[PDB]
Write a protein that binds this ligand. Structure first.
Ligand SMILES: C[C@H](NC(=O)OCc1ccccc1)C(=O)N[C@@H](C)P(=O)(O)O[C@@H](Cc1ccccc1)C(=O)O
Ligand SMILES: [Zn+2]
Length: 307
């Protein structure tokens, strides 16, 4: 609250507290991290991305976003702990230091800020964005069904009131289009990780079709390796496989889009638990969850460095 060493990582925070932590972290480490505004949400909130960078021109980069689905509160909490963790380990861990010496990391902690506010002010289990339009008194688009990969196909709903509603057309949600523009204008991302909760799964492309990706052998192996690093800490068991195969058919998801843009290392994590608490994970599981998913995410970045 006036030092990120004083910040309580073991509790759930509001949007203001998280954007203030971003300002404290940048002020504490101005040579390693900066805060970029890549857009504004439907209702007018700034959308912030943190860039962690050791220098260079157009370094190969890693995208990580959290909270695209606002009720999944373990993910924005894990992202605050990640941001802090990168300024603690850089210069101490050989592995992490070697990734950041050749690559940059972009971290988006709250991808859907209006939805996250709503989960605090009115409905804890709100999933969608907050746009209103037109044709329905039902608010919101599922922002993980709004991307241009299999858009509009089976695996998303067309009624506005559905939790899985895809939107009128791809990238209709400014929260999605802001990332699409930013990743394209950068033009040198090598990995794209989108973190959700729960089911304890590590998923790779496709959700919208049963056809295997051309890179399915290599990504299945990276997923085998990341899932074993994660399990090493506390015994937490993950499954892994393509989206459509390992949880269900879904069209318009972000990782299918990034993979189709040529970002080969595209993965989504489904964090703790497997059903007991669901979206309502105890605050006493935040840091255990954050610490073992760190191990799985480090294993993916190391493989992106080496290839
Ligand atoms: C919409 C769904 N609703 C729900 O009630 O989930 C129940 C459930 C429980 C256990 C297993 C499966 C589903 C839900 O919130 N799903 C979550 C499990 P989550 O939002 O993390 O799933 C992700 C999966 C995904 C990942 C990449 C590309 C496409 C799809 C998602 O729906 O976006
Ligand atoms: Zn989700």
């Amino acid at each position: 609250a006036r030092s990120t060493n004083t910040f309580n990582y073991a509790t759930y925070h509001t949007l203001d507290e998280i954007y203030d932590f971003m300002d404290l972290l940048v002020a504490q480490h101005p040579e390693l991290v900066s805060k970029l505004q890549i857009g504004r949400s439907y209702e007018g909130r700034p959308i912030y991305v943190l860039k962690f960078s050791t220098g260079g021109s157009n370094r190969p980069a890693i995208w990580i976003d959290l909270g695209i689905h606002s009720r999944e509160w373990i993910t924005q909490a894990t992202g605050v702990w990640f941001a802090k963790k990168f300024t603690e380990n850089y210069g101490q861990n050989p592995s992490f230091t070697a990734i950041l010496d050749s690559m940059d990391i972009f971290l988006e902690i709250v991808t859907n800020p209006n939805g996250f506010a709503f989960t605090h002010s009115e409905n804890r289990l709100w999933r969608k964005t907050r746009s209103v339009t037109s044709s329905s008194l039902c608010v919101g688009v599922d922002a993980n069904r709004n991307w241009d990969a299999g858009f509009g196909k089976a695996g998303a709903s067309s009624s506005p009131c559905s939790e899985t509603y895809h939107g009128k057309y791809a990238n209709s949600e400014v929260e999605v289009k802001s990332i699409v523009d930013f990743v394209k204008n950068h033009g040198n991302f090598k990995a794209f990780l989108s973190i959700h909760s729960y089911s304890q799964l590590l998923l790779y492309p496709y959700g919208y079709t049963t056809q295997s990706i051309p890179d399915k052998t290599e990504l299945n192996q990276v997923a085998k390796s990341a899932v074993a690093a994660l399990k090493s800490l506390y015994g937490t068991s993950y499954k892994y496989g393509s989206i459509i195969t390992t949880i269900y058919q879904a069209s318009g998801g972000s990782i299918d889009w990034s993979y189709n843009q040529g970002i080969k290392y595209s993965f989504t994590f489904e964090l703790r638990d497997t059903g007991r608490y669901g979206f309502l994970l105890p605050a006493s599981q935040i840091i255990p969850t954050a610490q073992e998913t760190w191990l799985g995410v480090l294993t993916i970045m190391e493989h992106t460095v080496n290839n």
